[PDB]
């Protein structure tokens, strides 16, 4: 996260008048796809006869 600071506007040369600096940063991660599978065997007649 960044960081802001209060600044005055009265006169130059005052340290309180100088705008501060700050950084933002990120990191990376991964979504990796994986597989769930199943085979269901059945007789052809079974399919044919079933209502």
């Amino acid at each position: 996260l960044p960081t802001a600071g209060w600044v005055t506007d009265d006169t130059s040369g005052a340290a309180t008048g100088t705008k501060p600096t700050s950084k933002v940063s990120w990191t990376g991660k991964n979504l990796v796809a994986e597989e769930i599978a199943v085979i269901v065997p059945v007789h052809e007649n079974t399919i044919a006869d079933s209502r």
């Binding site: 600096t21 700050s22 950084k23 933002v24 940063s25 990120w26 990191t27 990376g28």
Partner: protein, 51 residues
């Protein structure tokens, strides 16, 4: 403090080349050089003068 390239590394775009780097391809020297016949039979018999 500032955002370094290491801080923004996760945001950087990617590009991938549109095509594969490969050598050129060529056909058989045999089919280029020699006469060929359409075979309809899996064997052709050839008579040769012997004496």
């Amino acid at each position: 403090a500032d955002i370094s390239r290491a801080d923004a590394l996760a945001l950087l775009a990617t590009q991938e080349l549109d095509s594969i780097i490969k050598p050129e391809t060529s056909g058989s020297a045999a089919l280029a050089a020699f006469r060929s016949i359409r075979m309809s039979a899996g064997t052709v018999s050839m008579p040769v003068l012997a004496a």
